[PDB]
């Protein structure tokens, strides 16, 4: 079980992995 | 299980991975 | 399972992986 | 099982696999 | 099983697999 | 079981995971 | 007097006003 | 007399004013 | 007398005014 | 007289006058 | 008389003037 | 007279004024 709600990045470079993960 | 709600990403470069991701 | 509910993505450049993936 | 529901994504450029994937 | 639904993309150049794939 | 609930990321660069992990 | 010599845009959206204007 | 020589605009969005402008 | 010479611009949102102005 | 030579602008959001301004 | 020569600018967000401006 | 040479700026922030300004 797990949530990502409710997130605002406004800007975002050069980047990994930013959401959500799991096993 | 997961959720992947109400995100905003307003600009993204030159990423990998930026959403729900599991097993 | 997984949702991916929800995402506003304003713009997007050059990227891999940027939704729900499984297994 | 998942879902794939709801994305605006307004601009895409130079990109792989925006989308819902499994096994 | 998965769904594809509900989204709106604007724009897109130059890209790949932008929907439901699956096996 | 976790949460990633209301988070406002405004820039980011050059980053690797900055959401939720688990198992 | 004015040049608009050699320009490449990629893409580009919701604009006004890219070129070469005067008087 | 001005010159716009050369450029490279990527990816633009929303904008205004993005070449030569005079008098 | 200006030039507007060799401008790379990879992406720009939401901007006014990216180029050369006078007068 | 002006010179805008040679600038590369990675990524540029919600600016005004980025570029050769004069009189 | 002035130059803008050689610039790497990274990212830029919500700024004013960061380009030669004269007179 | 001035020069603006070789500056790299690797990211900047809701900043004014960043460039060569004169008269």
């Given at each position: ?5 409710g ?5 975002i470079?050069?980047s990994t ?7």
């Open positions: 079980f797990l949530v990502h709600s997130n605002n990045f406004g800007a470079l050069s992995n930013v959401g959500s993960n799991t096993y």
